[PDB]
Amino acid sequence: MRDTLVLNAFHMNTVCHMYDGGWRNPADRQVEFATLEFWKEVAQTLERGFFDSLFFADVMGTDAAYGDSWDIYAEQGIHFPMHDAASLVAALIPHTEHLGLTFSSSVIQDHPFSFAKRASTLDHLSGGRVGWNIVTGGTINASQNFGYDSLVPHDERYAIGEEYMEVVYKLWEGSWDEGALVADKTKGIYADPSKIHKINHRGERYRVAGPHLTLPSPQRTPFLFQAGASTAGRAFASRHAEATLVLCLTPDSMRVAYKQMQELLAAAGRASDDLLMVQGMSFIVGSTEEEARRKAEEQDQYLDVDALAARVSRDLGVDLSGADADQPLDTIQTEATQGIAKLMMEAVPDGRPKVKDLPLLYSIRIVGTPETIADELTEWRDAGMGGINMAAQMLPGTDADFVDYVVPELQRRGMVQHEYRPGTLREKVFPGRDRLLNERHPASRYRGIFS
């Protein structure tokens, strides 16, 4: 029973998250990412615009394309350098009040007992505003930073994923029962040892005695995001996610992905409203259509085709070292770019996708006036979009313009909330509910088991 869209800012603790070459724009200030002040400015603007959450993506490595020099990753800041997402989230707790603060953490980078302790602590310190995006994947280099020959294969990836979630739910939901905090000074009982338990977790990958070291936090289990794109990904998302970060190319493609996710939720034994679909988007906005277009052209000069080529060439295998920007994708001869040009045909103004349209794989950009952007967003919501995952082409500019121009329009039409509701991030996203996960959710099954 949430009538408004969920607004999530999609950022990353780095100089150039989303529109490769974007740092070079004189107008942009992503070069300031290592400072707290820059991030403070962004978090406060998003709170001013009534955003439900700010999200920080993260990675644990950096990789060359196959047979390519690593050079251009350093020169263009292509997701490198990369600073810790969790630290920034924490240092942002006191610069914000109501804004959700979400981060990615991978299976590989933190043992689930460690991570469970950290997340619990940030949930306490924040007042129940933490979210967690679960990463099972990784890149060759990230494997090699934690001493591993090569990638953990696709099957095992998600199975490891599952055990990890089983371990953190046992800790967050099972280890301390309701009523464990007593804190009676006169009677001399701080916590009730009859209600606190080891978890004695034993599985293929993890052995973990417990108990969990923290007091139950306001949410216990943080707000769960997941960006599974693949088959196993979508299934995992249906099992565990409260919001899934998706990348549909069109409203019709959202309707399909929506409908499919409803099937998987039913298989999971969850309700149709238990998971929001949150679509990747970015925005350029103006009082007239001519102003918006002109802002777009200014920013698009800083779109570095070779940096984008080096990001997409990693993510699709296929070498694209010499593609021109104005070159159509179908003019390139791979199975990857033949079927991605077919997909993109309807997402581009002219019906011919180009190398300069390849950012569409990562966020869908709408250019326009507040009214136009809102009408277009109305189509996406009616296709089953529950939320916006807003990436930036400039900081603080994309976020500032969106807040200053689009948010008021969306508010006027009742598509964005006018005030923050009281409660944890989970109670903000799912209005009538409890701070703890519903009984349909896997986590809920660890409640009570060790007593």
Binders of a second copy among residues 307 to 326 (CB under 8 A) are none
**Cα 67 from Cα 85, distance rounded (Å):** 30
- Whether residue 4 contacts residue 413, with contact meaning beta carbons closer than 8 Å, is answered with no
CA-based R_g, the chain, Å: 22
Is 339 a binding residue for a second copy by CB under 8 A? The answer is: no
**Cα 379 from Cα 17, distance rounded (Å):** 27
Minimum distance between the CB of residue 132 and a second copy, rounded to whole angstroms? 13
Instruction: Please give the DSSP secondary-structure letter assigned to residue 130.
Output: E
**Cα 299 from Cα 201, distance rounded (Å):** 52
The residue (of 40 and 293) whose beta carbon lies closer to a second copy is 40
**Residues of this chain, 157-186, that bind a second copy according to CB under 8 A:** 183, 185
Is 379 a binding residue for a second copy by CB under 8 A? The answer is: no
- Whether residue 447 contacts residue 173, with contact meaning beta carbons closer than 8 Å, is answered with yes
Amino acid at 159: A
Interface residue with a second copy, options 23, 132, 430, 450 (CB under 8 A): 23
Is 95 a binding residue for a second copy by CB under 8 A? The answer is: yes
**Residues of this chain, 119-148, that bind a second copy according to CB under 8 A:** 120-122, 124-125, 141, 144-148
Interface residue with a second copy, options 2, 36, 334, 444 (CB under 8 A): 36
**Does 58 belong to an annotated binding site?**
yes
Cα 397 versus chain centre, distance: 20
**Which uninterrupted H or E stretch holds 53?**
strand 53-57
The residue (of 53 and 120) whose beta carbon lies closer to a second copy is 120
**Does 150 belong to an annotated binding site?**
no
Six-digit token string for 15: 């100089």
Name every residue whose Cβ is closer than 8 Å to that of residue 298 and which is 6 or more positions away in sequence: 27
**Does 405 belong to an annotated binding site?**
no
Is 67 a binding residue for a second copy by CB under 8 A? The answer is: no
Minimum distance between the CB of residue 451 and a second copy, rounded to whole angstroms? 14
Q: Which stretch binds a second copy (CB under 8 A): 53-61, 153-161, 245-253, 361-369?
A: 53-61
Size of the chain, expressed as the number of residues it contains: 451
The residue (of 145 and 372) whose beta carbon lies closer to a second copy is 145
The residue (of 150 and 333) whose beta carbon lies closer to a second copy is 150
Interface residue with a second copy, options 18, 82, 310, 410 (CB under 8 A): 82
**Residues of this chain, 247-306, that bind a second copy according to CB under 8 A:** 304
**Does 321 belong to an annotated binding site?**
no
Q: Where are the alpha helices (DSSP H) in 27-153?
A: 36-48, 71-75, 85-92, 112-126, 140-145
DSSP 72-91: HHHHTTSS-SB--HHHHHHH
Q: Which stretch binds a second copy (CB under 8 A): 60-68, 256-264, 315-323, 405-413?
A: 60-68
Greatest CA separation found in the chain? Answer: 79
**Does 229 belong to an annotated binding site?**
yes
**Cα 345 from Cα 339, distance rounded (Å):** 10
The footprint of a second copy on this chain (CB under 8 A) covers a number of residues equal to 75
Minimum distance between the CB of residue 189 and a second copy, rounded to whole angstroms? 5
Minimum distance between the CB of residue 69 and a second copy, rounded to whole angstroms? 8
**Cα 357 from Cα 364, distance rounded (Å):** 10
Count other Cβ atoms within 10 Å, centred on residue 342. 12
Is 90 a binding residue for a second copy by CB under 8 A? The answer is: yes
Six-digit token string for 22: 């974007």
**Does 120 belong to an annotated binding site?**
no
**Residues of this chain, 214-243, that bind a second copy according to CB under 8 A:** 214-215
Residue numbering of the annotated binding site for FMN = 58, 104, 158, 227, 229-230
Residue numbering of the annotated binding site = 58, 104, 158, 227, 229-230
